[PDB]
Amino acid sequence: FVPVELATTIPVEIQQAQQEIKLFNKWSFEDVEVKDASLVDYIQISKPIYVAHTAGRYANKRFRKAQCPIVERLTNSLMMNGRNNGKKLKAVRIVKHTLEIINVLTDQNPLQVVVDAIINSGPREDTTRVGGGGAARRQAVDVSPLRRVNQSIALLTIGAREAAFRNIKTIAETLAEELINAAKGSSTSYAIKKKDELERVAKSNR
Amino acid sequence: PGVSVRDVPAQDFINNYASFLQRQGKLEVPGYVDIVKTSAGNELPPQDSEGWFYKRAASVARHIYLRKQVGVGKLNKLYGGAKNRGVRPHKHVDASGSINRKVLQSLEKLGVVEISPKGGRRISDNGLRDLDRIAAATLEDEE
Amino acid sequence: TVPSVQTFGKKKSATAVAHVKAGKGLIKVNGSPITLVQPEILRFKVYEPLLLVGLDKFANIDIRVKVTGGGHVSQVYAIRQAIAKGLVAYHQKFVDEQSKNELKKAFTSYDRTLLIADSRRPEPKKFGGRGARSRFQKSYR
Amino acid sequence: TPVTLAKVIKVLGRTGSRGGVTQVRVEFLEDTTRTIVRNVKGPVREGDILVLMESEREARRLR
Amino acid sequence: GSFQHILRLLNTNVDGNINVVYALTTIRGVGRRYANLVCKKADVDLHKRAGELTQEELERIVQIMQNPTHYKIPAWFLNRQKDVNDGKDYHSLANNLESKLRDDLERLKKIRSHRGIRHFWGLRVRGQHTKTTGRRRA
Amino acid sequence: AKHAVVLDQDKFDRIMKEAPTYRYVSVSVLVDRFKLGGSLARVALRHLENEGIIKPVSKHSKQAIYTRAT
RNA sequence: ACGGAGCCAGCGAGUACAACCUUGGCCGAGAGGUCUGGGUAAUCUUGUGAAACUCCGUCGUGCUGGGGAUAGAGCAUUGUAAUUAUUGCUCUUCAACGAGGAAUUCCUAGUAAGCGCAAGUCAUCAGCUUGCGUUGAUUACGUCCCUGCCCUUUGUACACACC
């Protein structure tokens, strides 16, 4: 509403976004409830930010990894392997292409599929290797709360990059499929299988 | 208004300039076209083949406009890039001198480049006209 | 005669100087307008000072920047810190404070440095190792 | 998969023979005022919620 | 479609489909930048698969392969130059080249030099340190 | 070589049959059916952008997403 | 990866009694030839417009256009001298290796790991070391389980002292 006139000429499509709605890139960042107690507060959609490439004074105190928006978590996780160490420009371009796939598939806000994928690839129980003499008996210890989020985002990118190792199906297509499978719990994607296969190990030693 | 070269994007500027030259075909050709490596380190020749030189000559002209006076050795260093020197780290060395020199020699006779004092090559009066006309043409393409 | 305050931002060695004036509404970067920049994906970052407070503020103020130092992406922060200060310097001197205070507290909620200069500079590489902390590989065989 | 709800009420130091385990007392959100001691692997803060399959059984210091 | 797959050229194999240059690289003599130089004279698309070609293009190319100085080559994109007493240059790009090198290697063995002595035993010729390199030998 | 790269006129009939009405259309999608492998799929997709048919979303080399024209 | 197009740093260094760094102009497909300078150095090389990167095209999952080792012929340069390829360049030769077994080293933020640049030795030779700036994570923010270090309390037939 009301395209403002300056000496420099900006397109109208950019000014359509301005003033009214504080959007992400084009579509809306608003809504997208988590609805899973444990991951509430740590997964943050309330922070509205446009571009996923900030300065970052995150890892300093202790619990400041929570402050970072979940779109920037996916960008940093793809940087593994020494060939791809650094270079967030390459990751940030790919993360835009993953979200464009989800917008096409059955409409939908793509962050609702991303947040639901984080819920459905976070283990409930992960055993710590206790000694007690020498042997590797595994006692059932519980998992909360950043450890459910930090493992889940890592397991998606491991399943994503391994699928596109010598393949035409380049990272953006595979990563989009992993989030749909986790959001719509299909028991096929390795984000779910690697989580489910640890469930499971705790109950045997209980 | 304020019709200048900087309103037009740098990558999109050369596309209108390349087609402008190929209509006339009066920028001149040296003789080394497509018998060429392009740089001192570059395995494959030019993929463009036809045209090619008109893309190069356009990008040389616009850089002579912005700066005071550009030379041959600096243009080779600017266009030139990385290598693969066996099983060692990748170095940087200059590009082809014979291609970039005959751009500057041929553009003098066409009516763009001028001989400057001290050292290098600055712009003529008629050279600024053709730069702005194509910039104005590219402004019409966008708007 | 015209109101001129020389604002400047800084991220690493990448420095930028925004000379503001009164007029029509120029926000140029190295001669070209705001919409170039040249990293191309990071064009959206340079709008962040504009789109938060609004384009209505820039209808009077005329800015132009010369950026040197650093790299490609580091220079975008230098421009963004310069334009953010460019408004505040104008609104502090020749405008009421309540407008300028609304700029301050707007940028706190979306604080990606903006007004504050960033802390991190590079640290020396000391002897015996491929870096500052990283040491060479040992062997006692 | 029986999902029992929970909530942190007290952090009990940093236990274990190794550094990678933390004891916690756990009160429930539904059916309040039922205190049980049980281990947590990751970071813990007052007011956090725990997800767990097996709830009523009790854990001890890991050796 | 599917017009011919092998498809010989001076006895050696030229596999169907693929490309102009990278099918021609199968010849024991032609490489990844010579076939582009040869294709430039005839003026054919590198975009095409090239195994499915017109009949005249094969025979036009073979004339350029045999004769270097006649067709448009600078005379310094050649494999071999200078042989016998005082005169001229020439090269080959077929089973001629592999046979030529064996005869040219015998010249080094006949004169009996530091290279020719090293070629007898199968050791490293170009001043390398043989305290590591190639733990197998031949 | 795992086949499906050689140019056949019989296949060019079936490309236009299976062109319209699809969610996913890209270089990533067509190779899964064992069609024109690799680069010839890009040339096949370049035909379908000329006379309408299928309209674009992304316009990058290596990331070329398209969607059907509603 | 292979093409164009876009195009940004900081540490340094540098001859007049020697032969140093050397823009600009012509010759050359390269390397390098030559005419000229300027600089005893925030003045000239130099903005040391360096790489990785950005963005459209060419190839696409085949030891392949990935990878570059072995090889042969000639064209350059530094030297009294390069055959025991000094060094670079030009076409050809086109292998080994589809993410590495027990083991094992370094590492808590502008760091790690990509990335080149400069100096040091230097008539001519970086796959090295010491320095600089670009690209910039994941993961602890605790513990004596392992490998060794400091004290106290205990035992000694040891005192060139558990070899």
From Swiss-Prot, chain C:
Signal peptide: none annotated. Residues 121-141 are annotated as: Disordered. InterPro entries: Ribosomal_Su5_D2-typ_SF, Ribosomal_uS9, Ribosomal_uS9_CS, Ribsml_uS5_D2-typ_fold_subgr. This is Small ribosomal subunit protein uS9. GO terms for molecular function: RNA binding; structural constituent of ribosome. Residues 132-141 have a biased composition (Basic residues). NCBIfam families: PRK00474.1. Pfam families: Ribosomal_S9 (PF00380). Belongs to the universal ribosomal protein uS9 family. GO terms for cellular component: cytosolic small ribosomal subunit. One of its GO terms (biological process) is maturation of SSU-rRNA from tricistronic rRNA transcript (SSU-rRNA, 5.8S rRNA, LSU-rRNA). Keywords: Ribonucleoprotein, Ribosomal protein.
UniProtKB/Swiss-Prot annotation, chain D:
PROSITE patterns: RIBOSOMAL_S28E (PS00961). It holds the Pfam family Ribosomal_S28e. GO terms for molecular function: structural constituent of ribosome. GO terms for biological process: maturation of SSU-rRNA; ribosomal small subunit assembly; translation. One of its GO terms (cellular component) is cytosolic small ribosomal subunit. It comes from the Eukaryota. InterPro entries: NA-bd_OB-fold, Ribosomal_eS28, Ribosomal_eS28_CS. The keyword Zinc-finger does not apply. Disulfide bonds: none annotated. Gene3D superfamilies: Nucleic acid-binding proteins. Keywords: Ribonucleoprotein, Ribosomal protein. PANTHER family: 40S RIBOSOMAL PROTEIN S28, SMALL RIBOSOMAL SUBUNIT PROTEIN ES28. Belongs to the eukaryotic ribosomal protein eS28 family. This is Small ribosomal subunit protein eS28.
